[PDB]
Paper text:
The S protein belongs to the class I trimeric fusion membrane protein and mediates virus entry via its receptor-binding domain (S-RBD) binding to the host receptor angiotensin-converting enzyme 2 (ACE2). The S-RBD undergoes a spontaneous conformational change between the “up” and “down” statuses, where only the up conformation is bound by the host receptor ACE2 (11, 15, 16). Among these MAbs, the antibody nCoV617 demonstrates the most potent neutralizing activity against authentic SARS-CoV-2 infection, as well as prophylactic and therapeutic efficacies against the human angiotensin-converting enzyme 2 (ACE2) transgenic mouse model in vivo. By determining the crystal structure of the human neutralizing antibody nCoV617 Fab fragment in complex with the SARS-CoV-2 S-RBD, we identified that nCoV617 is an RBS-C subgroup type NAb that specifically targets the SARS-CoV-2 S-RBD independent of mutations at residues F486 and N501 and some natural mutations in recently emerged SARS-CoV-2 lineages.
Numbering used by the authors:
A (entry chain L): 4 to 172, 174 to 214
B (entry chain R): 337 to 525
C (entry chain H): 1 to 135, 143 to 223
Write the structure that this text describes.
Amino acid sequence: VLTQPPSASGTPGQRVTISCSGSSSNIGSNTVNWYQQLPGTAPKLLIFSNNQRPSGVPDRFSGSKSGTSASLAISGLQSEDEADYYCAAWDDSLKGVFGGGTKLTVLGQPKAAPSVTLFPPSSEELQANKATLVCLISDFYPGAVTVAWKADSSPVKAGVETTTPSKQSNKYAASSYLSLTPEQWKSHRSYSCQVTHEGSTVEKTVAPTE
Amino acid sequence: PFGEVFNATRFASVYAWNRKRISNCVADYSVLYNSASFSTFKCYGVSPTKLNDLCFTNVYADSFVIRGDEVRQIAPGQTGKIADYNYKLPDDFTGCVIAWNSNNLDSKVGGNYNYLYRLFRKSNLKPFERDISTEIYQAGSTPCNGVEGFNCYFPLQSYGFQPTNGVGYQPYRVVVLSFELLHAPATVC
Amino acid sequence: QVQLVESGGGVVQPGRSLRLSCAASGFTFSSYAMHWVRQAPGKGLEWVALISYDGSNKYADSVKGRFTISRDNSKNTLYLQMNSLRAEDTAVYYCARGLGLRFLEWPISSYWGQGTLVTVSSASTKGPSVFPLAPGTAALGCLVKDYFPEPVTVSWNSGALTSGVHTFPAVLQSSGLYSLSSVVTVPSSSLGTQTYICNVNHKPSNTKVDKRVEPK
């Protein structure tokens, strides 16, 4: 009922704006509001009544409203602004509406190569007659990676599963799992996950010999 | 520019009242005094006549929404949560207070959430002082530590104007005309 | 000490019902409108409903015939009864306080609850198996394997160990079960003397598993 651009971005120090379109039933007759949401966390109010700030919200956050549109301006962009921004407005239906949300990415940030740790199947899992290899990828930017699994220098896509988000470190983390039978783990002489990032490939290897 | 003010689609909330500098237009105040669409039209320190005949450096038109039975508070020397916490006229004011019923513009079925007023303050406003703060209000003795606990409240409230409210509770649009000669009350030339 | 603690989440067969609760404690809950808002994983917030500080209930269209919002002011508790539940009802449900007292019911105030996850599916809840990942630093951890639904908690030494701890986001197998690893990086010299216990809580299964992780 309220449309926002899905994405926005800027460099630390820029001014980024986020737009919101509505209708006569909502933005056209009631005030607009803005919320900041960090990943999976409860949102925080930062603008009410078109351009008023709750106590604690910096003045580099700024709201405006004309007709059926509304805009959020973030001056002096900081990395801690990386988040989802929602406009919100009462609808005369007596509803209450959040726009789709705009994920804001703070872009000015140094590339970093990933750290890879590969665990063999534990002996306690092998006693359960299952076998999982665990590849953990850490501390990389930007967040795109390719993960590939090798059984005896041969690629295998059979039982692989992967992820990819950012963590405590703005740096990214991901994890990949290879499912195997105990016999497959014993009968091959080695397994690898190779992690490709910014053209450069880093690979780790485990073997049932060790 | 009496159009921007009296006929605006929307008025400000009383706590965040709007101010427009007039000074330089040409104002037949007498036509306003005659409307009878204005429920209220008190002048202070000057008569409705000779309202064109006074000299000043600045004129201001202040405007906001309040409920019907709060209009009597927009006058010098009044008490109450509007004159104490929202819009405060001074004792030696010179100018006029215009008001009219805006039930057909400012009420909504279910409730209007848009018109606000401040409920609490640590002290009364200064004449013509504007307070758009939203700090937590400590009502009791135990401080709030930045959180709205047991005796600790957001300092703003909504009128929730409904068409069916009693007339004392219906919204009234208010325009205060103010005449200044160098931060002193304007008089007649 | 303003708290909103909500519960009632978990897995529900489609079509059946479910009741959410939200217990408030640090303030005069009786004086405030309360909201419910949902968020499906990876998608936008959707407003669900509000209830005034006494009798005035507004609902989103997408739930208007199936959900009912309730208060019990003498128990300081907000409720949400859900009926004819559908796969698209799957989300994290937050309760949240109105911006101000009485009539300032809207907008919402950034005093929100923890959120609880509702899953509408025929799938049955399964507890995880937990395997140790044995180790100038070393890595060691716990593999948290084959659970549903989200989430699991992971701590180390009952929370006494914080440095070096990174719990990874879960992966979704084609089985529909999840798996997760938590890893901690340690100085390679500690492994002779100090010890590492991962603590896995899957509150949907109501299972707590602990695993010592030792050198080979």
